[PDB]
Amino acid sequence: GSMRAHLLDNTERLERSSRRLEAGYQIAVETEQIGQEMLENLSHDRERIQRARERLRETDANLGKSSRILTGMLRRIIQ
């Protein structure tokens, strides 16, 4: 009797297990769109940090200029 009942249980345990590898796959692939997004995001930030480091060097060039001007003023103060 309940012998093919087991064959029905055993067979359903397989069916949904296949639906867990289908989901497990969908989730992963989805996760590949996030991981990629992060890489796009990080590159963008890395660009902004380099741009800022650059803008800082220009601020330096101007501190240099102000330093020279001040020295020059310090000179003419002693006539």
Binding site: A52, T59, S66, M73
Partner: protein
């Protein structure tokens, strides 16, 4: 079957291992960004104070 699970599981556990380190790096990154923001902040405050003192120097030199 099986193994292609085990040797496919810990493949995941590996990614989990890398990502876990990654969030430790991002946390570290947030902290450095936090210090960077505080310093570029004093600079800005100081750059402005500097600009105001230069305007005064000009007016003072003109008088």
């Amino acid at each position: 079957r099986n193994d292609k699970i085990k040797h496919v599981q810990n493949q995941v556990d590996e990614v989990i291992d890398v990502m876990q380190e990654n969030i430790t790096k991002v946390i570290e990154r947030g902290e450095r960004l936090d210090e960077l923001q505080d310093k570029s902040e004093s600079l800005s405050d100081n750059a402005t104070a500097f600009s105001n003192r230069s305007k005064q120097l000009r007016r003072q030199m003109w008088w």
